[PDB]
Amino acid sequence: CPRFLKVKNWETEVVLTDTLHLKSTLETGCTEYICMGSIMHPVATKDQLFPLAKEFIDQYYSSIKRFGSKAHMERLEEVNKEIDTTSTYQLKDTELIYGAKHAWRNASRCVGRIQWSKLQVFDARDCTTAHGMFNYICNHVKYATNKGNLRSAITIFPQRTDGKHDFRVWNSQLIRYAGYKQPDGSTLGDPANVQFTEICIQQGWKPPRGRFDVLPLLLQANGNDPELFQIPPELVLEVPIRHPKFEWFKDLGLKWYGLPAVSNMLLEIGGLEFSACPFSGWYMGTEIGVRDYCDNSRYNILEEVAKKMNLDMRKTSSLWKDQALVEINIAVLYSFQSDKVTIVDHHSATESFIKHMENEYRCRGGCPADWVWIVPPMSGSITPVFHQEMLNYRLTPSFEYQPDPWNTHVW
């Protein structure tokens, strides 16, 4: 209603038909009179949980081609008695694996979804303490890093109960660099992490006060006050950034970590909420080269690089920023590759994503996709995704945003 929606690719003229949108139950934020497409961010009762669980179990049994089976019916009744009796329920291991992979399949902001079914799921639902969380995270980091040959993984901690016993990873990613405000108002290190760094120091962390200090983990188990743990340094793979032609590039002393491991999202499956679910894949180069290094509110290196390149910086129309941007991005890829650390460039990644989108239309009837996030932050129209119409809608299971845990926790 409408049944069929069409997307066009403006380079190939290929028109595709979406019916997967019909499975949407959650709202996007837009209305018929306003589009919120560029806005970054536009305790279940028994009664609410029943339908959400049924819908999930239903789709699970359908996916394994056993819809209507007595297994299907019995699982439904078991779940139903479980909710009725404890006001919640437990996923079977198979359901949790399915839910996690599908939350990734459904993530409309992820260009990496061709890999969605190749995902190692660590089931940490028996975890009870922050030291326990630390151990699981270390196994995840070791497994995922794999000496540079990165492998996708998610570690899933106990689901929410009453909301007073939440497991949380206070870090926004498992591995990030510290940020300190300087007396003159500038920032040393990564300005994105200034608040989180302050919390860590406040909690007792001794800060080395350099540019690329790996943050410790701040871990909350069962709603208890969070605890600090240092990731053993031999587990954190880093790459020093050099350039294949500019010998001076290494002199900038840039580096970055190999494993991008988002750790502050909420994974929702059949109405159940996994507030601690760090997951990791591998980098697309522009995430580091364009955003991390060249955002004005991040490491902000364009000007230094341009100076070393001896560019004429007096006029914006010389495109000195653009020129430097490319060199930086060349260096990031070249450095990761030289060190045998899995990375993908924005051309290869977006081309793969288009193939994935086409497979998804053919087998699933569509592929929810957020064009604003999917198109890379540089060279947008010389990647195929710029020219591809897309439709954005929300399927469950899904990854969602949740408030920072310091905004809620009582000590």
Known binding residues are 38, 110, 173, 282-283, 287, 372-373, 386, 401
Residue 157 interacts with ligand HEM (CB under 6 A)?
Answer: no
Residue 86, Ramachandran bin (φ over 0: left; ψ between -120 and 50: alpha; else beta): alpha
Q: Which of 116, 249, 283, 399 binds ligand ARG (CB under 6 A)?
A: 283
Q: Is-catalytic flag, 77?
A: no
What is the x/- site pattern for ligand H4B, positions 40-59, by CB under 6 A? Answer: x-------------------
Nearest by Cα to 189 from 255, 125, 133: 255
Give the 3-state secondary structure of residue 294. Answer: helix
> Which neighbouring-strand residues pair with 169?
219
Amino acid in position 40: M
Which amino acid is it at 254?
L
Contacts of 389-393 with C-beta under 8 Å, sequence gap 24+, read: 389/7, 389/8, 389/9, 389/10, 390/7, 391/5, 391/7, 391/18, 391/21, 391/366, 392/28, 392/37, 392/108, 392/368, 393/21, 393/24, 393/28, 393/108, 393/368
Q: Which of 95, 110, 176, 227 is catalytic?
A: 110
Near Zn ion by CB under 5 A, which window of 23-31, 87-95, 266-274, 319-327? Answer: 23-31
238 is catalytic: no
Closest CB to ligand HEM among residues 152, 388: 152
Interaction residues for ligand H4B, span 362-381 (CB under 6 A): 372-373
CB of 37 to Zn ion, least distance (A): 4
Q: Look up 116 and say whether it is catalytic.
A: no
66 classed as catalytic: no
Among 14, 15, 30, 201, binds Zn ion (CB under 5 A): 30
What number of chain residues touch ligand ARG (CB under 6 A)? 13
Question: Which residue type occupies 181?
Answer: K
Q: Is the peptide bond before 405 cis (omega within 30 degrees of 0)?
A: no
CA-nearest of 328, 327, 326, 387 to 353 is 387
User: Restricting to residues 160-179, which ones interact with ligand HEM according to CB under 6 A?
Assistant: none
Of 282, 320, 360, 367, the active-site residue reads 282
* Per-residue contact string for residues 106-125; x = within reach of ligand HEM by CB under 6 A: -x-xxxx--x---x------
Of 110, 174, 252, 330, the one binding its own copies (CB under 8 A) is 330
CA distance 236 to 250: 20
Least distance (Å) between residue 144 CB and ligand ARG: 10
Tell me the number of residues near ligand H4B by CB under 6 A: 9
Nearer to ligand HEM among residue 373 and residue 386 (C-beta): 373
Among 237, 85, 222, residue whose Cα is nearest residue 167: 222
For position 38 contacting ligand H4B by CB under 6 A, the verdict is yes
**Measured distance CA(15)–CA(389) in Å, rounded:** 9
* Contact partners, residue 126, CB within 8 Å, separation at least 6: none
Dihedral over Cα of 97, 102, 108, 112: its sign: positive
Give the whole-angstrom CA distance, residue 283 versus residue 289.
11
Using CB under 8 A as the binding rule, whether residue 29 contacts its own copies is answered as yes
Torsion of CA 380, 385, 387, 391, to 10 degrees: -120
Site for its own copies in 362-391 (CB under 8 A): 370-372, 375-382, 386-391
Annotated binding site for L-arginine, which residues?
A: 173, 282-283, 287
Which strand (E) or helix (H) includes residue 156? strand 153-156
Shortest distance (Å) from residue 391 CB to ligand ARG: 23
Q: How far is the CB of 362 from Zn ion (least distance, A)?
A: 25
Q: How far is the CB of 21 from its own copies (least distance, A)?
A: 5
Give the residue numbers of the binding site for heme b: 110, 401
Task: Tell me the two tokens of residue 47.
Answer: 């009664």
Which residues 37-56 are close enough to bind Zn ion by CB under 5 A?
A: 37
Tell the smallest beta-carbon distance from residue 398 to ligand HEM (Å).
8
Q: Contacting ligand HEM (CB under 6 A), which of 16, 133, 154, 156?
A: 154
